[PDB]
Amino acid sequence: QEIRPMPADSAYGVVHISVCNLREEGKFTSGMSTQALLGMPVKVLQYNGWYEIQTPDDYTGWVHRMVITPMSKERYDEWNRAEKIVVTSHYGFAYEKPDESSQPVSDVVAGNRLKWEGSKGHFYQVSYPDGRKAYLSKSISQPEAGWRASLKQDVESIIETAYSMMGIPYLWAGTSSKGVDCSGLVRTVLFMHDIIIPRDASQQAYVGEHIDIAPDFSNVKRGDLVFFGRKATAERKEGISHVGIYLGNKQFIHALGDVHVSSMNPADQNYDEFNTKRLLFAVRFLPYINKEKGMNTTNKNPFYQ
Amino acid sequence: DSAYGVVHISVCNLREEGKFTSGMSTQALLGMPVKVLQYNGWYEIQTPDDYTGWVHRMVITPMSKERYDEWNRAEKIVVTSHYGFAYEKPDESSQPVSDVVAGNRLKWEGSKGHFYQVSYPDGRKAYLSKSISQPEAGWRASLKQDVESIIETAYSMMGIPYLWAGTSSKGVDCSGLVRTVLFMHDIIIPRDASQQAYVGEHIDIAPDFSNVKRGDLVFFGRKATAERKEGISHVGIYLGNKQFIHALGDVHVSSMNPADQNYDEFNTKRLLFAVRFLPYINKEKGMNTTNKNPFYQ
């Protein structure tokens, strides 16, 4: 077909697999551009055999027909209003029975959110956007209201979550615990703390407070983002090629090959000469969550309300 | 310079060309031996299924032939659960070293508590819980390579996402589901559906499906014409009673019986034939087990 825009009964959707793969065009032979998660609300923009969708970070891309559940605004609103079970562990499964030896229904990853239906033993009974029923261990998940109540969004808590992803593979366009790109590591960590910021490194580079890094690095702080790339010239604007999370003491955690810690101190064993020489600036963003457009929490984000 | 290597991340992503903006073509696993064909900033590699593609320089450990051979001779710890992590200490609350997926193999160095001490190709040291892994000798001494066990493994992947070129427990494509399942049973077959279609024994499906058996592959696509050869588009694993398990959106079970609620009309209409392959492991170039495959020997 070529349906654009979508009819009202199919203008909205919810992702119903653990991690779905958005591509630049509606075909497998197009590059992946981002990913969305189980239970995540989306807008459905058009259909040509694949759906073009918009995720809550305003990013757009294309997914196969079978991986989202399209729906009316009314049904989308019902999904969003139901208290969720929030997956907090990186990896696990949901099961047919309250027993991890039973038939799985699907994998889950951190940030996956399913409708809470009940509880049985050491499990939450849950349902998927498509109507599947399952059980999730209380050891890898928890009810959304209590999750929010206990949620920490300080820099140290955020860095701990980044450290929990040590060695996970780099994957281009990767935006989940399964695999991450440079900007996707940032997003995957933040989403585990209920925070959404822009998807691409080139957009993350212009959020919050710009920090012109001092020669001694004294004005860059743990929790800032550090950006790398091609410096602006008279004839050409700057190009952002890479991002990491600053750790203090010239160290930073990032996704390149895998998630790892590097240094900008030439004396350190983990010195990353290539990126250090391409260092551009830092950004301090955490103070401005819900204070500028494009940076928000899911309790405030308009896709969720 | 380097002609050999070993993958040192859980799952690496091979692409058509040496750049991120080229399509993924297959994936390889932690501890898997590879041949290194060239370097242009990225490495062109060949995986043990004889498939080639490109990976970022940081994701494999290039080695001399002697070091490659030593890696291969080292007894491994084999990861048997779909997902987990290896840790800095024998404690799942300690700092992780990396994620792991089923089929990952690391060098066995010892044990502490209920954990194997392991090492990576690049030299990292870690601990893997005995609850998600098994020593290679014991793995081989308990190996299941029958149809029923292979189907059980496929069922254990229910609902996992479809991922184009996906070849691990994280996400699989149609042919990748077949490969991912089979590697958990020590079996390697060709990577692409268009090659899988011509292995083993070709089954010309009877109208009652009576000559198709559990564990056969079913192939879907475009029928040959007078002017044009057949095109293989899709593959699934036959479960009997006209059902098959496959990766399309996610891993799920479909039927070729129009009466069934899980009838898949699109694919049923495109059914071409089935293939009985399991009897022919180690009997044709490109189908083998890792104890016979020359990459490992």
Ligand SMILES: [Cl-]
């Ligand atoms: Cl990649």
Ligand SMILES: [Cl-]
């Ligand atoms: Cl995909």
